[PDB]
Structure formats: C-alpha cells, structure tokens
mmCIF file of C-alpha atoms in Angstrom:
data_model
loop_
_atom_site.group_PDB
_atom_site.id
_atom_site.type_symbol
_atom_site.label_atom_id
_atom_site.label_comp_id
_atom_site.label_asym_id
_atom_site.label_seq_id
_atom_site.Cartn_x
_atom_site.Cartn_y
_atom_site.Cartn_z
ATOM 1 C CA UNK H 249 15.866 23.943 -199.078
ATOM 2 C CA UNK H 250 19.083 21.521 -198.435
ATOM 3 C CA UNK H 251 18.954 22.888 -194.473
ATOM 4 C CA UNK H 252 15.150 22.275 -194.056
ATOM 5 C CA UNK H 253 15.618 19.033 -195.416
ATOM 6 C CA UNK H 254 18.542 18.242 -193.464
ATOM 7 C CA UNK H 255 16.624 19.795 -190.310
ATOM 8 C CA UNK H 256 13.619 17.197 -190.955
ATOM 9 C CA UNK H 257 16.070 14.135 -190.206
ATOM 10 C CA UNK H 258 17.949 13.111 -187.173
ATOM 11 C CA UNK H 259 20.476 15.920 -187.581
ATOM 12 C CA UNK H 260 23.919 13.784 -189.110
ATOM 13 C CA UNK H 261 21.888 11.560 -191.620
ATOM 14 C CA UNK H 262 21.582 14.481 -194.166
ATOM 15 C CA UNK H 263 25.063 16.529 -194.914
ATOM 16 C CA UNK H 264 24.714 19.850 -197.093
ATOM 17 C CA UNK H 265 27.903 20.485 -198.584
ATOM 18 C CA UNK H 266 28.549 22.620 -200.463
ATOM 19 C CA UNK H 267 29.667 21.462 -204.062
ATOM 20 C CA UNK H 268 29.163 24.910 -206.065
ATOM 21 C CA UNK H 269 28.091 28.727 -204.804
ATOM 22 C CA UNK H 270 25.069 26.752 -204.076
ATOM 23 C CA UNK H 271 24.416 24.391 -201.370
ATOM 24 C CA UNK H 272 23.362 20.862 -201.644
ATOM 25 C CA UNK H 273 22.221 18.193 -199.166
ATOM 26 C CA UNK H 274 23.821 14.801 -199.623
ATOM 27 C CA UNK H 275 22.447 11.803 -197.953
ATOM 28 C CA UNK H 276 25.869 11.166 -195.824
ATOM 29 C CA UNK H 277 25.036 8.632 -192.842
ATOM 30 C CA UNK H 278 22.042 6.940 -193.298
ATOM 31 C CA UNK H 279 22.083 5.010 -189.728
ATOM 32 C CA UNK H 280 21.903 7.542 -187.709
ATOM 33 C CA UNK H 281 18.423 8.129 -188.611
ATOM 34 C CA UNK H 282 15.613 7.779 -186.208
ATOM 35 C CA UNK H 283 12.139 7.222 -187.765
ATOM 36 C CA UNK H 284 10.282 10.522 -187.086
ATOM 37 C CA UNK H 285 8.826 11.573 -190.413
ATOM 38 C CA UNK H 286 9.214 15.239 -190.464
ATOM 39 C CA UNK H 287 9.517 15.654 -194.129
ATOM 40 C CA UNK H 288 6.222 14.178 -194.384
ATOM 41 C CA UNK H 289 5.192 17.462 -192.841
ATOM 42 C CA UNK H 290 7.088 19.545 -195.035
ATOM 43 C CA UNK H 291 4.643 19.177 -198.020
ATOM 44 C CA UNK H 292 7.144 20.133 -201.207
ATOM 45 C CA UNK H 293 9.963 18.102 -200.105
ATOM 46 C CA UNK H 294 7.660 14.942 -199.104
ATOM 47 C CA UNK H 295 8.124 14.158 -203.078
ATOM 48 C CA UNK H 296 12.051 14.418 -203.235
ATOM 49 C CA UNK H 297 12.725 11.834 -200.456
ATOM 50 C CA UNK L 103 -52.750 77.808 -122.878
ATOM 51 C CA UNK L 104 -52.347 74.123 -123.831
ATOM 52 C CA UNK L 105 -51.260 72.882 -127.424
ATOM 53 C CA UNK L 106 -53.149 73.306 -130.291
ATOM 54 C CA UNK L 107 -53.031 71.839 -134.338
ATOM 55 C CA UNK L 108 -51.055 74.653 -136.207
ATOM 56 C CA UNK L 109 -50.932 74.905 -139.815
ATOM 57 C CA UNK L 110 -50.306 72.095 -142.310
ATOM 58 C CA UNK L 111 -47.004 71.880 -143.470
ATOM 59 C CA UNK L 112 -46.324 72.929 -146.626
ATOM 60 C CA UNK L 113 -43.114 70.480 -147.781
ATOM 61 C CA UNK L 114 -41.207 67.925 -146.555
ATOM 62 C CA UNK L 115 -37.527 67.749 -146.805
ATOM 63 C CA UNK L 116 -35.794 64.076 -146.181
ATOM 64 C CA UNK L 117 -32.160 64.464 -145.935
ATOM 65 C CA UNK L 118 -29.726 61.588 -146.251
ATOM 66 C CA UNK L 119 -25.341 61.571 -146.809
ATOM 67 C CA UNK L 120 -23.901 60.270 -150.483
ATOM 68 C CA UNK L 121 -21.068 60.009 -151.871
ATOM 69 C CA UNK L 122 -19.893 59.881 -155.494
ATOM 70 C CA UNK L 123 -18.967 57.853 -158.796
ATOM 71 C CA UNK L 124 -15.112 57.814 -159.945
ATOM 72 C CA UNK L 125 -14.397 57.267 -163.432
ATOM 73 C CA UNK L 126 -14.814 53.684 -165.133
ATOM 74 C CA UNK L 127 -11.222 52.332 -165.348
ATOM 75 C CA UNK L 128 -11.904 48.498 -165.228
ATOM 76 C CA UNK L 129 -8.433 46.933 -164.193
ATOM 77 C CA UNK L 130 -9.543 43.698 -164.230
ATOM 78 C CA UNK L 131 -6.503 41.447 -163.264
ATOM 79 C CA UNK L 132 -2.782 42.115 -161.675
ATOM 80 C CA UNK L 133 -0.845 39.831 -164.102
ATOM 81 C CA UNK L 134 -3.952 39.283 -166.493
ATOM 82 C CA UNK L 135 -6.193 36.479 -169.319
ATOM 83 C CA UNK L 136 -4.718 33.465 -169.039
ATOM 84 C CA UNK L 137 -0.845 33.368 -169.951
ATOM 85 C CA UNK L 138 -0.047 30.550 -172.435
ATOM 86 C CA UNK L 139 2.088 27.784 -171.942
ATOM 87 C CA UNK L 140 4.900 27.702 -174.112
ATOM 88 C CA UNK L 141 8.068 26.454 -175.767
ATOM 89 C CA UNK L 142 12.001 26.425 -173.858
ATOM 90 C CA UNK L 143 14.121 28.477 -175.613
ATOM 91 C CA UNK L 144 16.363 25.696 -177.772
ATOM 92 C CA UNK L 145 15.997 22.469 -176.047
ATOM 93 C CA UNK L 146 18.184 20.104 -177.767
ATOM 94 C CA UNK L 147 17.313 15.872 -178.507
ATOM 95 C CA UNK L 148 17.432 14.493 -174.980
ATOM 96 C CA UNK L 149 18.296 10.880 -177.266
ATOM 97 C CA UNK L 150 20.064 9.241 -180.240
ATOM 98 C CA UNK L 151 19.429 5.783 -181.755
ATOM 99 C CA UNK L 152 22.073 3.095 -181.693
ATOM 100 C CA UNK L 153 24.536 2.823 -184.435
#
C-alpha cells in the first residue's frame, strides 16, 4: 500500500524506503507536490493522509 | 380451307429464368462496431510545479 500511496502524489513527495523486510512510505519532500487529490480516490488510504 | 377455332387449351405454362439463395453469412463491416478510443501506452507528466 506504501507504492499506491506514493503513486497518488506527484511522484518525489512520498519516498518508500524500506526500513524492515517490509516497505514503508515516508513523507520525504513535501514541495514537490502538486495539488491533484488522487488519494481522495483511493477510498482506504483517504483516512491515513 | 381457311382457319378455324380448335380445341381449348388444356394448361398454360409461363416460363421465366431464376437464380438462387447462398447461405446467410452476414459480414457486416471490414474493420467493424465502433473501435474505442483509448489510452497511450505510458505517457509520462508533461509538467512539474516550481520548487
């Protein structure tokens, strides 16, 4: 779910590293985002953001 | 010796030429329906915001 969510935002605004075996997004450049909304779309990750 | 009414005739036959029926195929269209519009394969941002 960290690569939807970081496919819903301007693509550098939401970095997945990868901390453990499992992968998690981290919020790494928040400027680069353009307003476009797409995780308001998504519908289970509206409520995480 | 001149020409006399003979007998009735008997039938009538009306002959006419016709051809015949091939089987119902129905090919309606070369390249057919309407095709859909659709989506370029990949297409990439065409723009970035400032900063």
């Amino acid at each position: 779910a960290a690569e939807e969510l970081s496919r819903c935002f301007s693509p550098g605004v939401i970095e997945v590293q990868e901390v453990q075996g499992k992968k998690v997004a981290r919020v790494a450049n928040p400027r680069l985002d353009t307003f476009s909304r797409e995780i308001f779309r998504n519908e289970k990750l509206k409520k995480v953001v | 010796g001149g020409l006399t009414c003979a007998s009735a005739p008997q039938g009538t036959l009306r002959i006419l030429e016709g051809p015949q029926q091939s089987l119902s195929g129905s090919p309606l269209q070369p390249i057919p329906a309407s095709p859909p519009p659709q989506i370029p394969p990949g297409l990439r941002p065409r723009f970035c915001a400032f900063g």
